[PDB]
Ligand binder design. Sequence first.
Ligand SMILES: [Mg+2]
Lengths: 153, 152, 153
Amino acid sequence: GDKPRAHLTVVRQTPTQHFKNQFPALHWEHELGLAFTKNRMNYTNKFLLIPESGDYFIYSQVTFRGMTSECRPNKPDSITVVITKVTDSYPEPTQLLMGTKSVCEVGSNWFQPIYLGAMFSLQEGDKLMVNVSDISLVDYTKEDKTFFGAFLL
Amino acid sequence: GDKPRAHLTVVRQTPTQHFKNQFPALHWEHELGLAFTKNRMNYTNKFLLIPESGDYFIYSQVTFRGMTSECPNKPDSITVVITKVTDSYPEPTQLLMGTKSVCEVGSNWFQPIYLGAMFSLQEGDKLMVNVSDISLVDYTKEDKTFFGAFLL
Amino acid sequence: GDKPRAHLTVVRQTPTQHFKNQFPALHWEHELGLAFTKNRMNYTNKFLLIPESGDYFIYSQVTFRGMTSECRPNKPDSITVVITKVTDSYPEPTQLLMGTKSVCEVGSNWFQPIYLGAMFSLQEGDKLMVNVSDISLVDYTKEDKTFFGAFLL
Ligand SMILES: [Mg+2]
């Protein structure tokens, strides 16, 4: 009755150059506020490490915000958030979830969240992580706006 | 085993202006239809008191709808926030929050907002959902706007 | 211990005969990739048959993708997705969840996902199916973009 589980909450995000056309990954707050990691759930190196094989329900919401770029017609821009796992086996990451949506707004600006949640079978030693299209667009402001979680079922 | 859990569906939700405030909490149906409360967890006037302390998964969708309003000008918006109120500390702490900027371009619009996340709630704590604008909230169907939680 | 659970994933999709005035259901992948069914959870005939009574968490995400339509302004277009529960008793469906949003996207094309999830009490033999407003709008391209799942609590 003490299954591994953790709810991570956003932070400012220390800028750290990433590969070109490569999706940046966020790092989080894991012990302050509403965040936490327990029952051997280890959040290390911007990774959420799995303490044991089994089926976990992982979820994450990422609120994006920005000034209207809206440019015929103009080909839409896109914001996207992806949750992926990396294993001992193929170091080649496997995308589990991906909420991607077109954005061609009007008005002073815009802002909206992308929430995904599902259940996958992970093996101990697996490392989860969220990635996003554009880091500068993630609202790091509030704790209840951008989060990431996972718990053994 | 069998632990606490519940699934509330939307209802009428009459208007108001009592106690003067913003981000009105919604009312739910705790039994009629797909709705239900079990294992010591009960709905009680906008709240959802937790029977047993432990880790919970709170979730909820609130379908919004309204007639398009002209809108470079700062856009209006919609938001839904789930709150945890505890007797120990008065100040209700916001757990979740989905805010979407609205600025349509047609007859009208609609679109739900869904939020799901796990938290470590305390026994005797009270959960409730709040929305930017109570009137925009759709009350037609129960599968459109719901709100629940269970003990993991 | 051994609780029923299954995570299904989208596939190209095969045209089906148009008979009644109803929502098209989706059929999926239940073994390859991130897909799976276990502990007596049976995926048969486009339905997710419930092995045991009790409470389940049903979830699904359908990423829609289309071409910009046109829109006293013009009434908006819309897309929907609804998880339906069909009982052994009355053959009449029972819409459990329902996600529907309008669309007037001003741009070349668009695309956006719709995620829904909730806990219900289901009986044995009961079936579950995901329906959509427009089949041809569903993005079947990736497994993580359109999925359907459920597990016992
Ligand atoms: Mg097959």
